[PDB]
């Protein structure tokens, strides 16, 4: 029954940075890891811009206590370009790297041999089998799924995924952590896409196909879903927000797992934007352009 | 270009009642039609109850203004059990009856006989091809789709659908009418489900399949979609809200136009609830139980 205090987050992208932010904002020590020192600097800078907003809401009439919160949270976030030299002693490792099974497995097979025994390994994957990633180590009882939602500082949901090997103890800890993070945990079975993604991704593709079919423009499709279904964002806005590259990897993943399923049929327009390095908000341009 | 002023709304259910309510609230002469006098009585009663919730808000600080808004609106709504007696002097007929092609054409074939020459016909259908419905008359140039969203008094979207035969003059009148209702009209191609239904319904079916499979529960699936995607309602809360009968009808229609399509595969759980007459909130029970 380990209490999570020291957290290691691998990947300082859209999800990783946010996870680190929230983890730090709620009094946990965090070590954010990524490829280069430039990347980290960018992630850390992003986490700050995100904290300024969270600032106006918790400390509006208090500018002094405003900076305090921001400085302290950034301070509780250490950075490193070497995972192995950080996970030697950590309470939990939350992986948030490229959506690719092979790459994730290699990373965990490696860290498994460095991290202390009590350490717990968690994948924030959107569409992969926790069991498949977990069986890349010899710590499956301490391996599980811990899925966050973009933007991590806003979305309250966290899907805690147990594999048939995950221990109750591992589970409970991750549950407590989720609540310590001020999030709402929901235990899910280890099925592709879990809940939210299994239902949101297929829907996002369809909206693309409706566009590819020639029946409507992206703008009207977005307007329609927001004013008609009350959705926060149109399906194309959301795609761009989440990242076209990430969406593609998810879909290509499910496609291999079952090519006959017409619901995993990859999109030409999506693949073309990715091949042109237009991943949405990330690169400054996806279906839409951003300044 | 006719200026829609008098509107005959056929169907005093979830949509019709709302369509007549909004039209009334916006200074349009309305006639609400339904099968029996009792049914119309409950409808009118519902619109009144709905009008006050709106009063309590939109006029919270002015009771008189609220009272007058309620009375004045209910006052513009007349009831008749036979639309054929009313259409000869109406500007627009917005049909909002059971989702059934046969039964919709029947109604329109009849009305086409009694309606004034300038009268525009509009179906609020969610899944059927307007061209089909329109071909039961010889008024195709004055026939079109005007799709609203539940609940009508809140949702701002209105899909205005032209068939290849709809006249520009007819289209503009509907757009002007949509705007007069305080809505945001979106011109859509006459294709199954237009925009929103075409994207939303298949998703709702997937949420159902996720459940029948045993992967998760309805409650967690709803929590998951709300907290993770920001949706106003979980899929099951929404199915019950919309009506399981209507939903089932929507899917069966599509399932027959493309039996193999996995998107429109019928649901055992949904069919069984419909058969047991549990259509959702309107019947006091659907996937969930209400008061
Ligand atoms: C295939 C097809 O069939 C096509 C379709 O139409 S698909 C269905 C489309 N509609 C949707 O997807 C529904 C999604 N849900 C929603 O957007 C929202 O939950 C909602 C519009 C129903 C409102 O929910 P809500 O915000 O929680 O309101 P609720 O808490 O229910 O009621 C309180 C407020 O809502 C309003 N309200 C809710 N239902 C209302 C109604 N029937 N009439 C008038 N007002 C209503 C009140 O005026 C009230 O005002 P305040 O905010 O100032 O307090
Ligand atoms: C791929 C997978 O496997 C799983 C995934 O994650 S799927 C994607 C999951 N996420 C969603 O579905 C995205 C849907 N979109 C949303 O829910 C909403 O658009 C949203 C939460 C981003 C808010 O957007 P919005 O409605 O346009 O409002 P916005 O003005 O942008 O923000 C609203 C509030 O949140 C804050 N905010 C938004 N983004 C923020 C961030 N990155 N950090 C901290 N605060 C933020 C704002 O300061 C604002 O606060 P106030 O209202 O008090 O002033
Ligand atoms: N985009 C979303 O909204 C969203 C939400 C939930 C989960 N996910 C999932 O979370 C993961 C994170 O996606 P993301 O949006 O943050 O993508 P991202 O591209 O923004 O972030 C990934 C980060 O991984 C880093 N990285 C790659 N290989 C690495 C390695 N070996 N060691 C350290 N860092 C490495 C990259 O430099 C990058 O900064 C994916 O598996 C995705 O399916 C995405
Ligand atoms: N349920 C929704 O939320 C929703 C949203 C948008 C559009 N729609 C579409 O709008 C239509 C309206 O559905 P609804 O939710 O109001 O259903 P409903 O079951 O609540 O209302 C239907 C009404 O039609 C009446 N009716 C049935 N046959 C009739 C006939 N021959 N002549 C006159 N009246 C008749 C019934 O007495 C009832 O009051 C359907 O075509 C549906 O596809 C439904």
PDB file of C-alpha atoms in Angstrom, chain B residues 24-199:
ATOM      1  CA  UNK B  24     -44.942  30.965 -30.109  1.00  0.00           C
ATOM      2  CA  UNK B  25     -42.453  32.732 -27.859  1.00  0.00           C
ATOM      3  CA  UNK B  26     -41.079  34.498 -30.922  1.00  0.00           C
ATOM      4  CA  UNK B  27     -44.393  35.989 -32.018  1.00  0.00           C
ATOM      5  CA  UNK B  28     -45.498  33.361 -34.524  1.00  0.00           C
ATOM      6  CA  UNK B  29     -49.127  32.251 -34.701  1.00  0.00           C
ATOM      7  CA  UNK B  30     -48.973  28.552 -33.814  1.00  0.00           C
ATOM      8  CA  UNK B  31     -51.338  25.619 -34.087  1.00  0.00           C
ATOM      9  CA  UNK B  32     -50.262  22.492 -32.236  1.00  0.00           C
ATOM     10  CA  UNK B  33     -51.767  19.262 -33.563  1.00  0.00           C
ATOM     11  CA  UNK B  34     -52.031  15.754 -32.143  1.00  0.00           C
ATOM     12  CA  UNK B  35     -54.236  12.648 -32.197  1.00  0.00           C
ATOM     13  CA  UNK B  36     -56.493  13.328 -29.218  1.00  0.00           C
ATOM     14  CA  UNK B  37     -57.631  16.255 -27.102  1.00  0.00           C
ATOM     15  CA  UNK B  38     -56.093  14.710 -23.994  1.00  0.00           C
ATOM     16  CA  UNK B  39     -52.687  14.401 -25.628  1.00  0.00           C
ATOM     17  CA  UNK B  40     -52.818  18.072 -26.621  1.00  0.00           C
ATOM     18  CA  UNK B  41     -53.797  18.924 -23.050  1.00  0.00           C
ATOM     19  CA  UNK B  42     -50.743  17.217 -21.589  1.00  0.00           C
ATOM     20  CA  UNK B  43     -48.596  18.863 -24.258  1.00  0.00           C
ATOM     21  CA  UNK B  44     -49.886  22.367 -23.581  1.00  0.00           C
ATOM     22  CA  UNK B  45     -49.415  21.604 -19.885  1.00  0.00           C
ATOM     23  CA  UNK B  46     -45.825  20.595 -20.581  1.00  0.00           C
ATOM     24  CA  UNK B  47     -45.103  23.713 -22.612  1.00  0.00           C
ATOM     25  CA  UNK B  48     -46.484  25.783 -19.742  1.00  0.00           C
ATOM     26  CA  UNK B  49     -44.310  24.016 -17.186  1.00  0.00           C
ATOM     27  CA  UNK B  50     -41.375  24.506 -19.559  1.00  0.00           C
ATOM     28  CA  UNK B  51     -42.200  28.162 -20.136  1.00  0.00           C
ATOM     29  CA  UNK B  52     -41.992  28.919 -16.423  1.00  0.00           C
ATOM     30  CA  UNK B  53     -38.610  27.278 -15.863  1.00  0.00           C
ATOM     31  CA  UNK B  54     -37.623  29.707 -18.620  1.00  0.00           C
ATOM     32  CA  UNK B  55     -39.446  32.529 -16.855  1.00  0.00           C
ATOM     33  CA  UNK B  56     -37.780  31.871 -13.492  1.00  0.00           C
ATOM     34  CA  UNK B  57     -34.496  32.430 -15.307  1.00  0.00           C
ATOM     35  CA  UNK B  58     -34.912  34.876 -18.202  1.00  0.00           C
ATOM     36  CA  UNK B  59     -37.088  37.031 -15.875  1.00  0.00           C
ATOM     37  CA  UNK B  60     -35.943  36.065 -12.359  1.00  0.00           C
ATOM     38  CA  UNK B  61     -35.896  39.731 -11.332  1.00  0.00           C
ATOM     39  CA  UNK B  62     -39.254  40.681 -12.887  1.00  0.00           C
ATOM     40  CA  UNK B  63     -42.166  38.364 -11.952  1.00  0.00           C
ATOM     41  CA  UNK B  64     -44.723  40.327 -13.975  1.00  0.00           C
ATOM     42  CA  UNK B  65     -42.540  40.144 -17.077  1.00  0.00           C
ATOM     43  CA  UNK B  66     -42.332  36.413 -16.465  1.00  0.00           C
ATOM     44  CA  UNK B  67     -46.076  35.992 -16.039  1.00  0.00           C
ATOM     45  CA  UNK B  68     -46.840  38.025 -19.139  1.00  0.00           C
ATOM     46  CA  UNK B  69     -44.256  36.102 -21.149  1.00  0.00           C
ATOM     47  CA  UNK B  70     -45.846  32.810 -20.076  1.00  0.00           C
ATOM     48  CA  UNK B  71     -49.471  33.851 -20.737  1.00  0.00           C
ATOM     49  CA  UNK B  72     -48.711  35.619 -24.012  1.00  0.00           C
ATOM     50  CA  UNK B  73     -46.878  32.578 -25.349  1.00  0.00           C
ATOM     51  CA  UNK B  74     -49.399  29.944 -24.277  1.00  0.00           C
ATOM     52  CA  UNK B  75     -51.945  32.316 -25.760  1.00  0.00           C
ATOM     53  CA  UNK B  76     -50.474  32.050 -29.256  1.00  0.00           C
ATOM     54  CA  UNK B  77     -50.678  28.258 -29.187  1.00  0.00           C
ATOM     55  CA  UNK B  78     -53.967  26.807 -30.456  1.00  0.00           C
ATOM     56  CA  UNK B  79     -54.743  23.082 -30.513  1.00  0.00           C
ATOM     57  CA  UNK B  80     -56.555  20.948 -33.135  1.00  0.00           C
ATOM     58  CA  UNK B  81     -56.767  17.176 -33.530  1.00  0.00           C
ATOM     59  CA  UNK B  82     -56.840  17.438 -37.318  1.00  0.00           C
ATOM     60  CA  UNK B  83     -54.174  19.402 -39.163  1.00  0.00           C
ATOM     61  CA  UNK B  84     -56.120  19.113 -42.428  1.00  0.00           C
ATOM     62  CA  UNK B  85     -58.590  21.604 -40.979  1.00  0.00           C
ATOM     63  CA  UNK B  86     -55.841  24.115 -40.288  1.00  0.00           C
ATOM     64  CA  UNK B  87     -53.370  23.911 -43.159  1.00  0.00           C
ATOM     65  CA  UNK B  88     -55.470  25.815 -45.713  1.00  0.00           C
ATOM     66  CA  UNK B  89     -54.551  29.095 -44.019  1.00  0.00           C
ATOM     67  CA  UNK B  90     -51.097  28.283 -42.579  1.00  0.00           C
ATOM     68  CA  UNK B  91     -47.691  29.510 -43.801  1.00  0.00           C
ATOM     69  CA  UNK B  92     -45.606  26.535 -42.715  1.00  0.00           C
ATOM     70  CA  UNK B  93     -46.240  22.997 -41.552  1.00  0.00           C
ATOM     71  CA  UNK B  94     -43.509  21.528 -39.370  1.00  0.00           C
ATOM     72  CA  UNK B  95     -44.176  17.825 -38.891  1.00  0.00           C
ATOM     73  CA  UNK B  96     -42.857  16.247 -35.707  1.00  0.00           C
ATOM     74  CA  UNK B  97     -44.590  12.879 -35.496  1.00  0.00           C
ATOM     75  CA  UNK B  98     -43.315   9.309 -35.052  1.00  0.00           C
ATOM     76  CA  UNK B  99     -40.176   8.478 -37.029  1.00  0.00           C
ATOM     77  CA  UNK B 100     -41.812   6.378 -39.735  1.00  0.00           C
ATOM     78  CA  UNK B 101     -41.584   6.934 -43.498  1.00  0.00           C
ATOM     79  CA  UNK B 102     -44.917   5.328 -44.392  1.00  0.00           C
ATOM     80  CA  UNK B 103     -46.795   7.213 -41.680  1.00  0.00           C
ATOM     81  CA  UNK B 104     -45.035  10.495 -42.568  1.00  0.00           C
ATOM     82  CA  UNK B 105     -45.848  10.336 -46.293  1.00  0.00           C
ATOM     83  CA  UNK B 106     -49.443   9.396 -45.551  1.00  0.00           C
ATOM     84  CA  UNK B 107     -49.832  12.544 -43.467  1.00  0.00           C
ATOM     85  CA  UNK B 108     -48.234  14.695 -46.161  1.00  0.00           C
ATOM     86  CA  UNK B 109     -50.205  13.247 -49.052  1.00  0.00           C
ATOM     87  CA  UNK B 110     -53.374  14.248 -47.197  1.00  0.00           C
ATOM     88  CA  UNK B 111     -52.260  17.731 -46.102  1.00  0.00           C
ATOM     89  CA  UNK B 112     -50.964  18.573 -49.581  1.00  0.00           C
ATOM     90  CA  UNK B 113     -54.646  18.489 -50.584  1.00  0.00           C
ATOM     91  CA  UNK B 114     -55.831  20.957 -47.933  1.00  0.00           C
ATOM     92  CA  UNK B 115     -52.876  23.334 -47.763  1.00  0.00           C
ATOM     93  CA  UNK B 116     -52.757  26.761 -49.323  1.00  0.00           C
ATOM     94  CA  UNK B 117     -50.706  26.920 -52.509  1.00  0.00           C
ATOM     95  CA  UNK B 118     -47.960  29.002 -50.849  1.00  0.00           C
ATOM     96  CA  UNK B 119     -47.713  26.767 -47.785  1.00  0.00           C
ATOM     97  CA  UNK B 120     -44.270  25.313 -47.097  1.00  0.00           C
ATOM     98  CA  UNK B 121     -43.948  21.755 -45.802  1.00  0.00           C
ATOM     99  CA  UNK B 122     -41.179  20.729 -43.443  1.00  0.00           C
ATOM    100  CA  UNK B 123     -40.275  17.459 -41.742  1.00  0.00           C
ATOM    101  CA  UNK B 124     -38.282  17.401 -38.450  1.00  0.00           C
ATOM    102  CA  UNK B 125     -37.075  13.918 -39.297  1.00  0.00           C
ATOM    103  CA  UNK B 126     -33.721  12.713 -37.934  1.00  0.00           C
ATOM    104  CA  UNK B 127     -32.879   9.839 -40.238  1.00  0.00           C
ATOM    105  CA  UNK B 128     -35.112   9.765 -43.308  1.00  0.00           C
ATOM    106  CA  UNK B 129     -34.440  11.268 -46.717  1.00  0.00           C
ATOM    107  CA  UNK B 130     -36.453  14.441 -47.241  1.00  0.00           C
ATOM    108  CA  UNK B 131     -36.679  13.631 -50.956  1.00  0.00           C
ATOM    109  CA  UNK B 132     -38.650  10.513 -50.008  1.00  0.00           C
ATOM    110  CA  UNK B 133     -41.152  12.337 -47.815  1.00  0.00           C
ATOM    111  CA  UNK B 134     -41.472  15.164 -50.325  1.00  0.00           C
ATOM    112  CA  UNK B 135     -42.366  12.794 -53.144  1.00  0.00           C
ATOM    113  CA  UNK B 136     -45.663  11.923 -51.444  1.00  0.00           C
ATOM    114  CA  UNK B 137     -46.792  15.381 -52.536  1.00  0.00           C
ATOM    115  CA  UNK B 138     -46.672  17.530 -55.662  1.00  0.00           C
ATOM    116  CA  UNK B 139     -45.234  20.389 -53.668  1.00  0.00           C
ATOM    117  CA  UNK B 140     -41.535  19.371 -53.715  1.00  0.00           C
ATOM    118  CA  UNK B 141     -40.475  22.935 -54.503  1.00  0.00           C
ATOM    119  CA  UNK B 142     -42.114  23.939 -51.216  1.00  0.00           C
ATOM    120  CA  UNK B 143     -40.973  20.851 -49.325  1.00  0.00           C
ATOM    121  CA  UNK B 144     -37.837  20.681 -47.198  1.00  0.00           C
ATOM    122  CA  UNK B 145     -36.327  19.503 -43.939  1.00  0.00           C
ATOM    123  CA  UNK B 146     -36.221  21.664 -40.824  1.00  0.00           C
ATOM    124  CA  UNK B 147     -34.474  19.645 -38.133  1.00  0.00           C
ATOM    125  CA  UNK B 148     -34.417  20.893 -34.552  1.00  0.00           C
ATOM    126  CA  UNK B 149     -32.596  19.559 -31.497  1.00  0.00           C
ATOM    127  CA  UNK B 150     -33.926  18.307 -28.179  1.00  0.00           C
ATOM    128  CA  UNK B 151     -34.674  20.341 -26.157  1.00  0.00           C
ATOM    129  CA  UNK B 152     -35.868  22.892 -28.693  1.00  0.00           C
ATOM    130  CA  UNK B 153     -36.050  25.882 -26.341  1.00  0.00           C
ATOM    131  CA  UNK B 154     -32.334  25.522 -25.491  1.00  0.00           C
ATOM    132  CA  UNK B 155     -30.395  24.031 -28.406  1.00  0.00           C
ATOM    133  CA  UNK B 156     -29.579  26.685 -31.016  1.00  0.00           C
ATOM    134  CA  UNK B 157     -28.946  24.455 -34.014  1.00  0.00           C
ATOM    135  CA  UNK B 158     -31.434  24.014 -36.833  1.00  0.00           C
ATOM    136  CA  UNK B 159     -30.513  21.986 -39.896  1.00  0.00           C
ATOM    137  CA  UNK B 160     -32.349  23.330 -42.939  1.00  0.00           C
ATOM    138  CA  UNK B 161     -32.275  20.673 -45.655  1.00  0.00           C
ATOM    139  CA  UNK B 162     -32.857  21.254 -49.359  1.00  0.00           C
ATOM    140  CA  UNK B 163     -33.681  18.437 -51.740  1.00  0.00           C
ATOM    141  CA  UNK B 164     -32.742  18.758 -55.371  1.00  0.00           C
ATOM    142  CA  UNK B 165     -36.256  20.137 -55.905  1.00  0.00           C
ATOM    143  CA  UNK B 166     -36.536  22.610 -53.045  1.00  0.00           C
ATOM    144  CA  UNK B 167     -36.781  26.126 -54.441  1.00  0.00           C
ATOM    145  CA  UNK B 168     -34.392  28.867 -53.390  1.00  0.00           C
ATOM    146  CA  UNK B 169     -37.418  30.894 -52.285  1.00  0.00           C
ATOM    147  CA  UNK B 170     -38.513  28.057 -49.995  1.00  0.00           C
ATOM    148  CA  UNK B 171     -35.006  27.635 -48.586  1.00  0.00           C
ATOM    149  CA  UNK B 172     -34.604  31.340 -47.741  1.00  0.00           C
ATOM    150  CA  UNK B 173     -37.961  31.462 -45.958  1.00  0.00           C
ATOM    151  CA  UNK B 174     -36.922  28.606 -43.724  1.00  0.00           C
ATOM    152  CA  UNK B 175     -33.535  30.196 -43.005  1.00  0.00           C
ATOM    153  CA  UNK B 176     -35.281  33.467 -42.184  1.00  0.00           C
ATOM    154  CA  UNK B 177     -37.742  31.473 -40.055  1.00  0.00           C
ATOM    155  CA  UNK B 178     -34.952  29.650 -38.244  1.00  0.00           C
ATOM    156  CA  UNK B 179     -33.286  32.980 -37.461  1.00  0.00           C
ATOM    157  CA  UNK B 180     -36.637  34.437 -36.366  1.00  0.00           C
ATOM    158  CA  UNK B 181     -36.830  31.585 -33.888  1.00  0.00           C
ATOM    159  CA  UNK B 182     -33.518  32.821 -32.497  1.00  0.00           C
ATOM    160  CA  UNK B 183     -31.715  29.807 -33.938  1.00  0.00           C
ATOM    161  CA  UNK B 184     -28.489  29.211 -35.889  1.00  0.00           C
ATOM    162  CA  UNK B 185     -29.502  27.477 -39.160  1.00  0.00           C
ATOM    163  CA  UNK B 186     -27.035  25.235 -40.953  1.00  0.00           C
ATOM    164  CA  UNK B 187     -27.769  24.245 -44.558  1.00  0.00           C
ATOM    165  CA  UNK B 188     -27.196  20.484 -44.930  1.00  0.00           C
ATOM    166  CA  UNK B 189     -27.211  18.005 -47.827  1.00  0.00           C
ATOM    167  CA  UNK B 190     -30.188  15.626 -47.904  1.00  0.00           C
ATOM    168  CA  UNK B 191     -28.290  12.569 -46.695  1.00  0.00           C
ATOM    169  CA  UNK B 192     -29.202  10.085 -43.940  1.00  0.00           C
ATOM    170  CA  UNK B 193     -28.900  11.686 -40.523  1.00  0.00           C
ATOM    171  CA  UNK B 194     -27.783  14.956 -42.100  1.00  0.00           C
ATOM    172  CA  UNK B 195     -24.937  16.077 -39.808  1.00  0.00           C
ATOM    173  CA  UNK B 196     -25.578  15.630 -36.077  1.00  0.00           C
ATOM    174  CA  UNK B 197     -27.689  12.447 -36.160  1.00  0.00           C
ATOM    175  CA  UNK B 198     -25.327  10.848 -38.652  1.00  0.00           C
ATOM    176  CA  UNK B 199     -22.484  11.336 -36.187  1.00  0.00           C
TER     177      UNK B 199
END
